[PDB]
Amino acid sequence: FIGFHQFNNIAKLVASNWYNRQIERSSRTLGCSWEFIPVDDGWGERP
Amino acid sequence: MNINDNLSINSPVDNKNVVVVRARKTDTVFKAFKVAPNIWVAPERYYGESLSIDEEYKVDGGIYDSNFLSQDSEKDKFLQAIITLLKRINSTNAGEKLLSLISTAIPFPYGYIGYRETNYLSSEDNKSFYASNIVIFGPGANIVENNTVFYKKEDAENGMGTMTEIWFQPFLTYKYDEFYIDPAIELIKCLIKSLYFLYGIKPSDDLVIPYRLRSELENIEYSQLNIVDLLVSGGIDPKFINTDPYWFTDNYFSNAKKVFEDHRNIYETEIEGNNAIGNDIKLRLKQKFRININDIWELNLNYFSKEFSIMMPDRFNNALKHFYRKQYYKIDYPENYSINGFVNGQINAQLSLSDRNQDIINKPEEIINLLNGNNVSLMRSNIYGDGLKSTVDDFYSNYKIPYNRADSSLDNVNIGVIDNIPEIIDVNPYKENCDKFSPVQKITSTREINTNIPWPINYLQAQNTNNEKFSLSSDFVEVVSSKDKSLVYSFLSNVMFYLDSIKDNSPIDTDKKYYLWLREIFRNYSFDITATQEINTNCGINKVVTWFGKALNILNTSDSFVEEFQNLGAISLINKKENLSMPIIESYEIPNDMLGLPLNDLNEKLFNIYSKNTAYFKKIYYNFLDQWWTQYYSQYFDLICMAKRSVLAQETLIKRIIQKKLSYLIGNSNISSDNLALMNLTTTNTLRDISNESQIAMNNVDSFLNNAAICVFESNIYPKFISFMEQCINNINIKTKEFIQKCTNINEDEKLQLINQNVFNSLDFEFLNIQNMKSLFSSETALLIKEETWPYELVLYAFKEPGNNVIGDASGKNTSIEYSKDIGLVYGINSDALYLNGSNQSISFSNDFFENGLTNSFSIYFWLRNLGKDTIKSKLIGSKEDNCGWEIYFQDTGLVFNMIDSNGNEKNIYLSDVSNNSWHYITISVDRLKEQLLIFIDDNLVANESIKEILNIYSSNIISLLSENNPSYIEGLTILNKPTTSQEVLSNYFEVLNNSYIRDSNEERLEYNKTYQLYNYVFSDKPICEVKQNNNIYLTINNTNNLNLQASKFKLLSINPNKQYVQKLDEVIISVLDNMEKYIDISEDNRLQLIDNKNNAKKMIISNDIFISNCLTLSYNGKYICLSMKDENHNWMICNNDMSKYLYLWSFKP
């Protein structure tokens, strides 16, 4: 799954099978869970 | 990690990483080892406190040993232990940053009369100085109390910063609920606090917030906690002080931020780039100031609790001495504890009790004297204080909520950069860098108080005996007036009733008789301890612990505690009902300078006042929430703790009863030696089963009492808030109306629109969010505990890496997996399935739970597809040793579930028709509380049986998946430590089943470009065939038996070449191979026909029914596909919406 990992002080986007070894909801804090935010008239800041 | 590992207590002095240094200005010297830049460990007792102290000064809960850490052997063990803990902390990015920060956090140097550092250790000859921020010692006088002290108070308060000494105790830990305290987090706490000292931000000793109302005392008195400890210690408590907006402040915060900037500036302008200074110092300083002061205030244990997945006490965690009597356990490094933390985690680590437990000093805050009518003492019980300082006096009354307002904190710490800063080598020492250390002395006052009514602490105490022989009794008065005195107090009704029913019986001789006894002992204990009843309350339905009143003597004067609690409400459980103090406000005046302003400006200026006000409301609410926590929840948490202690006391009684019976049979009986052996192993498993049951009960009292406390906030506190707020906005509304009328420069139409814009109503302050109340108690710890204690003992996962097949267990338990190297993986129902060839391939799972026993319950489930051939009985999966345990066999066309105990009693149950070479979901449920076996195949319940006749099934700790002689597929194998219900099975089965995939008749994924035959749900054995009518060709089924119509051959096609598997809502073209390739079209009569030209082919939408696993549906333009009425006789495939629902289900068979 796509997620992130610390390399030095950088958090780099990673695909890591370590996620696939995990059960579903674990904590609330995953690292492989994402949100997709489209520009929406209801929010409307300046891109 | 790269913490210095090269040290032992006998390491020679090199004057670099091993030194002998002076302690402050004293005549005393000590050996120190440098484990990291500026960070030292000094493996002896703290020098500053006498090891032998007067009896009067020994604090409650303390352990005092002058010979502890005296020997070289002990000192080394210490030094290695700390090194081990620092390694663990450094091995996680969060704690690695913490140590790195602390390393570079050197105190600010003084100026010329070049620069003079205050952080250094002096050699005895006083010609050599070693840079140190942090020095870690062993304990002071009290050997269970950790501590963090500052080298110089002044430098800790003034922004310069000061060196920090730590007193730590790696060798003892205690249990809190189900887990052992992790010394690693205990040390991280000391480390975080040193940040305050290193930065010179230590607050006044007087900056203190209310922590706990002392509801044990006759008078009104609070325990207080310094802001530093509250911010560092984590848990829930801080959420009440640290708020948005803040209802609590002090000049401390604004001033600390101020002085910090002063010092940053002195650095920026002067020290940085100054060649008279040198990199080992100025570079570190540069990093010390990359931080923000806020980052330190925001940093606490909750964060590391999460990053390290460490459990910690989350409620009043600085008051625990009052709520709890600690019992200490030895920790040996690295057998018990290593760089990964406790071996087998904080729950299941095997730690030995310390022989020191008996040396613990017991000095009660007050003593409850329970007399009778004749004024003579029946019992004397101890209540212990929290240790914190008190009052003085009431904070809430005299605190004014300010009207005018004036996650990750380690983000800005750079590990790489810091690790490249050469160590401080040439130190120019500042002479007076330290205070004479003065030890704290404390005399502990005790109150005696008399009562004719037993307090909860009385009822608790009556639940203990030191009598080797004792009897359970439900009469409290009889127990404490005992002329025995052998009686002990118990609420376990089912257990007492069972014990009585067998009183006259012939003694236990067979092992069978012991099992029948032990099992009933277990079931009855479970029934007694987990008892709950749901009731309707003011705030809802609450699941009440039934025995609560009989345990603590609360609402216990009725014949029923439950109905009395339903009657009187949540507030009736606690002793101090009205603690609230209406807060002092800042009265409301609108400036006289706005009286003549023009509209636009008047308008937008009242908008500002509007916001300030609504924010002010929020502050007030917060203040009420804090009082609730401090005054009210504190009392429910006391109830929770006492109730939990009651459960332990009862559990202990039970185990002792069991242990005596086992000990006795082993002592004198004719039971065979190795039968005794089994009995011993088995009983152990039962004692675990009893703890698991105790745990369910301790969760019950937590939910029950937490809900109650929240109900008290809605029912009692909240409405006082609402009263206060409508008086408040009624006032505000007045003053704002009076103000607007007095406005000179606006007209009358303006006044009315303005008054309207600015008016407040109740909705502006109705902040209650019940979900937020509830979410308070979900901490990282509560979550971690859920995940560690959930029913999964095995969860089998598998997937394909390049050049590798991965198989593992997700349960988070101790399960070990061993399997053939060449086992293959294939997509199953929802995931990759294991392929066992039947010949050489096997896989085995190892968990101590798997051995089962007499009293535990479990469930086994998995998906299985078997390419069924032989009828001969063959092991598939099971756990068996010495001919006990369970096995699932392949037999005939089905499975057999076999269960057999050590006495030879058996379940042998044939499950018909499981090898059709179609996937099936097998669920097996073993419930010892209901004595019930449940077996499900797919969505059906195939067997429901009593297992009262099956006793001890103890097997090996290994489950073996063999699948002898029958190549098969196995997927999602799971073992649970609890039984499964029919709702859960259905939910598991269907949830997994809709992943968007369409399936063939065997519930394998439907593939594009693969040849299938087509069947309608209503005639399941009759394939679709093609027949021509008028020089064109249609699709029907064969109702003329062997009319020798050939089964027509179908292939699904996708507009997308890359698409392999068929999914819900896909667009599809249906093709057939006859002579050439023929494609499906819809006629004008809505009858399907095979045509010549792919272009004309109709694109159909394929989908499926969520409850029919092997079937699919087909539609065009919203018109679904089905079978027509009889015609020829022939039944045509038609596109029509008016037929019976069953006719729209099809399946493809390969």
From TrEMBL, chain A:
Compartment(s) of residence: Host cytoplasm, Host cytosol; Host cytoplasmic vesicle, Host secretory vesicle, Host synaptic vesicle membrane; Host synapse, Host presynaptic cell membrane; Secreted
Organism superkingdom: Bacteria
Protein family per UniProt: Belongs to the peptidase M27 family.
Name of the protein in question: Bontoxilysin-A
Organism: Clostridium botulinum
Encoding gene per record: a
Portion of the parent chain present: 1249 to 1295 of 1296
